[PDB]
Design a protein around this ligand. Structure first.
Ligand code: NAD
Ligand code: NAD
Lengths: 475, 475
């Protein structure tokens, strides 16, 4: 039967019971020992309340806000007898503030995004840089510098960000092995960064193709997705953003850097969900992805940075999302951007509504001697239904990653604020893999210059096919 | 009963029997008196042959080519006893050469596109300008100058190009009434151009939204459309192209004009089916259209050009397509452009396969005192099935326009080479209207600057919402 990894000796407070909370709850119940009355879900939605009631779990129907979060969460997380676990799977709440509160009170913490308090993403007085995931991530890095060590809090540990950081490490090990390079696997950040440098990894796409399809066609004026519509649209309207590689020799006129922080990022002055990049996955082959900002675009590039003695970056990979969401989401973006406003309504596809498909999610490492290598999960909806309830394939990759991070945090409970890049990738993948379906590594000879130039002039760099100049879709 | 407009006494030579030929044949049989044995259908495909054989119509299984067209077509066109009618609904054939051959032999002629001989659309030695619909149309204008008058040949008389020219005239009449502009209805090209100028029509979109949906979801690696896949992809890979208004104050860096010809056009050095424009239809409301090149973008702008005594253009409207095809076609374009190559397979949706939807096809006249006015057809698939066989709503708008043009040609058989803009629009609409479903005029206060500027800096012209600078979507 299913492994029970650890006892949780305190309250389990799940903030948010949307598509990810609904998929994560059964995994927590399955894989951890605790008295049932220890678990409580907090979500303002009536829909969520009804589902929670049907699942027999405690539910508090309340929005967590800047004004109530201390009064609500401190008693809940400290109810005892020992250390609780805040499992934050919400929108509209501050990851930073909730994380800090959990830490101050000795509770473990995990989330899947650096979310801000409601109001931030559309605040007209914020400059684009301030709305970037680079800037949100810097608040977490600052919190870590301010209070090193202490109770473990895991930032951005879903499928992506999250699992994909573990895939990058496995992909690097595999690339080395496939070249006949043997020996000790890297242990330290610096060693991982040098492995990427030494292997000639110029950049990495988080290369995803969701092929899940519903039993009904996309309704007019309804945004359809396989996970948070609100969350997808919010990140989609943030600036396009990427970890920026040392090999790059061109950026768009509307690209901008940052004065401060880890140094690994640029952003573009346009919304990422209306920015296209040329990319590739094994099932899609060549496809457009949307250049939607993601925490790991920065965190992976930062993690794999090699600096010289003076502290100057001398190697860093480009890293960004290249997302092809489900067909109905593609249509939803075309509708939304074409209308200039959010649809009147939205819906998230339930497993009962999905007729077939997979969430093909992996990392595409390029520029090395074998050109490009994609490593990741090809989890299908049919396998999903066999192995975990109340979610689709998109959901299960995320919920199983939260499970893995929770196991890691319980096993390493004094590690301080950590990113997915800081965790033991082998342990995390050991926990997660039973929920990932086929996990495969595939080489390809495809590059962004395949078939180009066509019959129109274009600005391309034929000396270096994977340059962002060639990847970015431009007029 | 259905009106039988005229007897056709000579051969009826239908070149091509794909979606439009299949929809047009039954209308020809319905609306003209003739011995069925005088029909002949020419198409290279087995699929077409079996359909023709099922209708008990003479069929010749040949591709018409530059090498064979004279020897193949002349005996068919001249078989007698009376004047024949060449109904050209093909791909890969020269409209110009076939039209000239028909005229040389006294046969009436109609088509729905200025098609070139196979090889043109992908010829790598052609400069972009030479690949343009403007250039193709100029070959037709030159033929007309070289041989004025004579046997009628109707160029580009489908739904669009074709019908939409008649809609422009009706829309101008309606606007004049609604704006209280006095004067008699124009009866010459010069008078129509002056009316458009006097009404302050800055430009016109051919504003189309196809909402037809099939009973099966879009297959991976299959291009799906409601009419010619080959034809749509060919025009989609031609340069984006538009009739260019005198009111425009800006064009993109990759726009180009023409050194010769009617003077009415520009094109962009990028493919039209991967070029988006902000537009509007009554059912879509605000939407993206694709800026796919079309004959009428040039012909309507040219028709409505006012020149001074010296012959310099002092007024001309912008005119271009703003096409939102069916959702499966939108996905097909994303797939094709994302892959960098045509899909392995394609299919045209049959009425038996379509579950619901309309082809909302009209003209959006903007810049006048009531902002914007859309006039056109909202034909549904359900109405289509009630009134005509063997076609979907897209096909019926086209086949019924061909019918109208054929009636007009029989009633005006010595009018020379004519475009849809040259035909008597009321007679054509009188014939066509029974097949158009609801035909309506709708005003809107929408403009391309609605909601702008938003979250990011944009390169807009706030002085005039309808400038192309505001309409064109930048990547
Ligand atoms: N890293 C990844 O791989 C990954 C993947 C998917 C989702 N996510 C993130 O996880 C979060 C949840 O995604 P989802 O698909 O479950 O979203 P969802 O939209 O399905 O659910 C969000 C839930 O948050 C609740 N909520 C709203 N305001 C709240 C508040 N003030 N307090 C508490 N709850 C509140 C809503 O009622 C809703 O049930 C989102 O932030 C999303 O961006 C991360
Ligand atoms: N103006 C408009 O509104 C409008 C609308 C739709 C289509 N069209 C045009 O009408 C034409 C027909 O469209 P469709 O949807 O019927 O296309 P289709 O692709 O369904 O059919 C094209 C037919 O042409 C035949 N063909 C190919 N090569 C040939 C040759 N050398 N000689 C004779 N026949 C040949 C094919 O075998 C096929 O049956 C296309 O050129 C298209 O661009 C115009």
């Amino acid at each position: 039967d299913w492994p029970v990894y650890h006892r949780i000796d305190g309250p389990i407070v799940m903030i948010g019971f949307g598509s990810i909370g609904r998929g994560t709850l059964p995994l927590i119940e399955r894989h951890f020992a605790f008295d049932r009355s220890k678990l409580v879900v907090i979500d303002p939605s009536d829909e969520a309340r009804k589902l929670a009631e049907a699942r027999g779990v405690r539910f508090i129907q309340q929005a967590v806000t800047r004004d109530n979060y201390r009064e609500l969460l401190v008693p809940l997380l400290t109810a005892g007898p020992g250390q609780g676990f805040c499992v934050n799977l919400s929108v509209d709440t501050s990851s930073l503030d909730i994380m800090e509160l959990a830490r101050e009170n000795g509770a473990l913490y995990i989330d899947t995004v650096v979310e801000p308090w409601l109001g931030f993403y559309f605040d007209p007085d914020l400059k684009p840089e301030a709305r970037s995931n680079y800037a949100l991530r810097e608040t977490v890095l600052a919190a870590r510098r301010n209070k090193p060590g202490g109770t473990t809090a895991v930032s951005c540990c879903g499928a992506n960000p999250g699992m994909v950081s573990w895939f990058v490490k496995q992909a690097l090990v595999n690339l080395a092995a496939d070249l006949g390079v043997t020996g000790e696997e890297p242990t330290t950040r610096e060693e991982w960064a040098r492995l990427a440098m030494d292997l000639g990894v110029k950049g990495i796409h988080i290369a995803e193709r969701d092929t899940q399809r519903a039993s009904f066609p996309k309704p007019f004026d309804v945004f359809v997705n396989t996970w948070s519509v609100e969350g997808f649209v919010s990140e989609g309207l943030q600036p396009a953003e990427l970890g920026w590689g040392t090999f790059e020799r061109w950026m768009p006129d509307n690209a901008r850097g940052h004065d401060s922080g880890c140094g690994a990022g640029i952003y573009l002055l346009q919304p990422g969900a209306n920015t296209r990049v040329r990319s590739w996955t094994p099932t899609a082959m060549a496809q457009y992805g949307f250049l939607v900002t993601h925490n790991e675009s920065i965190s992976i590039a930062d993690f794999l940075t090699v600096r010289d003695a003076a502290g100057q970056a001398v190697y860093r990979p480009t890293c960004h999302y290249a997302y092809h969401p489900c067909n109905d989401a593609v249509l939803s973006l075309h509708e939304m951007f074409g209308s200039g406003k959010r649809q009147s309504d939205w819906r998230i596809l339930d497993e009962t509504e999905i007729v077939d498909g997979i969430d093909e999610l992996g990392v595409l490492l390029y520029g090395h001697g074998k050109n490009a290598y994609w490593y990741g999960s090809q989890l299908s909806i049919e396998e999903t239904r066999r192995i975990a309830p109340d979610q689709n394939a998109t959901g299960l990759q995320v919920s199983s990653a939260v499970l893995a991070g929770m196991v890691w945090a319980l096993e390493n409970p004094n590690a301080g604020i950590v990113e997915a890049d800081d965790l033991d990738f082998r342990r995390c993948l050991e926990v997660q893999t039973p929920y990932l379906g086929p996990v495969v590594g595939v080489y390809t000879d495809w590059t962004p210059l395949a078939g180009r130039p066509g019959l129109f002039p274009e600005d391309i760099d034929t000396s270096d096919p994977w340059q962002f100049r060639n990847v970015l879709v431009r007029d």
